[PDB]
Symmetry: C2
């Protein structure tokens, strides 16, 4: 099916991406991971998102998540994500065409023991997909948690 007019401004996402990232937070020791993401569509004003991570040396599976990106022509966007760990997120924010960036903050984080808010920011940088994920808890204010850079396959 053809790309929906609401999806067209984000068409640069469509395809499969692979790279690596790093995680850290006050309570845990820092770690590295591999990551793969696929963005796809079926002609609706929605982009399907699927993701997995693994251990670098062995390729041993770690986590996975999936969901849907819903952009609108005013530059607003909502994103819904379910994670393999048992969490859900409702993310809202904006995308910027000239910068090829997407900036999101959580309206809701569901079924979490400690996590309060999550922010997710994407940017296309020299054709590579970069992101930063920040997270808060009741006692730790919103701060860096994950960052990764992926090449388009």
């Amino acid at each position: 099916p053809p790309v929906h007019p609401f999806v067209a401004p984000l068409s640069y996402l469509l395809g499969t991406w692979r790279g690596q990232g790093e995680g850290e937070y006050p309570t845990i020791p820092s770690f590295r991971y591999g990551e793969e993401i696929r963005f796809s569509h079926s002609g609706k004003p929605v982009i399907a998102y699927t993701q997995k991570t693994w251990k670098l040396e062995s390729g041993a599976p770690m986590h996975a998540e999936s969901g849907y990106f819903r952009p609108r022509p005013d530059g607003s966007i909502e994103v819904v994500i379910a994670q393999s760990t048992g969490l859900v997120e409702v993310q809202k924010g904006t995308y910027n065409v000239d910068e090829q960036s997407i900036k999101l903050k959580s309206d809701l984080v569901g079924n979490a023991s400690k996590v309060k808010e999550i922010s997710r920011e994407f940017e296309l940088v020299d054709g590579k997909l970069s992101y930063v994920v920040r997270m808060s808890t009741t006692t730790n204010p919103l701060q860096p948690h994950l960052k990764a850079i992926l090449d388009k396959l």
Copy 2:
């Protein structure tokens, strides 16, 4: 990877399923749809769930959803789902081995304009996967909304 011991009691789900269903509710006219579901795993205590629906005559895409099933040896289970329409659900309940059934009710429905609670019940019937989805709103109590039967491919 081998099937995790927490996933083994639900191994009957693993694979791809295709069939059809019917939807209805006080406010909307009744309708029919085709449906496909895949359940898969990566050796963790988690089953990945992906689903799509279409119009029967043409195969024209309608909706999609995805998420994760997390069963535990005491017979409890939690399920997280993100939908293409922009909703999320946290589902909790129980599974029964002798009946090959799973019964879930929502802890949370996120980003919904009208929906308050959702229940989802699965049963394997002569090797076919059946479900019923019930839904409530502020003014409509929990009641039938979707039902489908799918054959294992």
